[PDB]
Write a protein that binds this ligand. Structure first.
Ligand SMILES: O=C(Nc1ccc(Nc2ccnc3[nH]c(=O)c4ccccc4c23)cc1)c1ccccc1
Length: 249
């Protein structure tokens, strides 16, 4: 179908990115609420990224999963690109974090679970190494998790350590996340980027004493240096800490 700025009335900003801004917006024709994301061919060029785009767009365009944010259309004009996207009313897991500083284990476990399925399907169709920082998780109207990705702490040992990664990478992220949710910050934070290198090659981290065994078990298996040792998803899903907690309607 053919899109055009004119078929959208434009709403309030929801964020300003590097190449542009995302907005709330509605399709004049169905009154369909969604998000619009605005790029400037201009800044795209000078960061020569148009290559990074046109790919991921494609990719995205294809994917369909409840937990991954949808990309509906994309259209362009004179001097910026438009990206039509699903709107996620409840915002990002990143503010949710800032706000509760920390998540309880049911919330975490459940979010993991989503991720895991997401990650799985995304894998199935042969796609990997998403950045899944918390500011690339949005929330659905149900608080249903959902993901949208298009530094650092979330890189694994085999990537910083300039070596050979696969989709186990996705298992590490998931550890970091699960750690970050529960504790509040990510397990290899550090002040300079070179402490973080270090921290990550020795996988050097520690739990606060409020963190249950269930969790430390899981987390630990995910955060292993040898890609091969870490679980796989349906294992993770099948972990007990998870099943015990994962509210799953
Ligand atoms: O630019 C892209 N991704 C993307 C991902 C998320 C958002 N922004 C939102 C979209 C929908 N709901 C949202 N809800 C929000 O609450 C929000 C808050 C801050 C920033 C963005 C959003 C946001 C905008 C763009 C993109 C590029 C290539 C492929 C796919 C997506």
């Amino acid at each position: 179908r053919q899109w055009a700025l004119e078929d959208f009335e434009i709403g309030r900003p929801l964020g300003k990115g590097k190449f542009g801004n995302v907005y709330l917006a509605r399709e004049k024709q169905s009154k369909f609420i969604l998000a619009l994301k605005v790029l400037f061919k201009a800044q795209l060029e000078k960061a020569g990224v148009e290559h990074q785009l046109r790919r991921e767009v494609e990719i995205q365009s294809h994917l369909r999963h409840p937990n991954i944010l949808r990309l509906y259309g994309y259209f362009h004009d004179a001097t910026r690109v438009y990206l039509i996207l699903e709107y996620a009313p409840l915002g990002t897991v990143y503010r949710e974090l800032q706000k509760l500083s920390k998540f309880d284990e049911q919330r975490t476990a459940t979010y993991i679970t989503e991720l895991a399925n997401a990650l799985s399907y995304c894998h199935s169709k042969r796609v990997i190494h998403r950045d899944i920082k918390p500011e690339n998780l949005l929330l659905g109207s149900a608080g249903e998790l959902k993901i949208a990705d298009f530094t650092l702490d979330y890189l694994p040992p085999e990537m910083i350590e300039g070596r050979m990664h696969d989709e186990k990478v996705d298992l590490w992220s998931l550890g970091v996340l699960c750690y970050e949710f529960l504790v509040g910050k990510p397990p290899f934070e550090a002040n300079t980027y070179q402490e973080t290198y270090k921290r990550i090659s020795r996988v050097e981290f520690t739990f606060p004493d409020f963190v249950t065994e269930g969790a430390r078990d899981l987390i630990s298996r995910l955060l292993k240096h040898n890609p091969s040792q870490r679980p796989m998803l349906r294992e993770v899903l099948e972990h007990p800490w998870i099943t015990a907690n994962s509210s799953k309607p």
